[PDB]
Amino acid sequence: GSSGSSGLRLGDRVLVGGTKTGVVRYVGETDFAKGEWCGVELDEPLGKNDGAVAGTRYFQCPPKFGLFAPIHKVIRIGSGPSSG
């Protein structure tokens, strides 16, 4: 469903899991799992990797910070078509 809330910009604060807030560092397909994944970087050491899959590093990040998760499994915090 290509409407608007999809893809996630490269550098936006998104929710991963439903509690851990992290900014998007990478967006696109991977070389391990089929489909499109999004590399979300957290503020605390609550990650699994540092944006490196089998040596393939899409984005430079410190150890235990970046967490690769499916795009559909990512929630956005920012709203574009909003006013308040």
Q: What is the CATH number of domain 1-84?
A: 2.30.30.190
Residue matched to tokens 């990478």: 26
Question: Residue 71: which of 9, 27, 12 has the closest Cα?
Answer: 27
Query: DSSP labels for 28-84?
Result: EE-SSSSSEEEEEEESSS--SBSSEETTEESS---TTTEEEEEGGGEEE---SS---
Cβ atoms of residues 53 and 31 within 8 Å: yes
Question: Residue 42: which of 63, 26, 71, 66 has the closest Cα?
Answer: 66
> What are the sequence ranges of the domains in the chain?
1-84
The experimental method is NMR
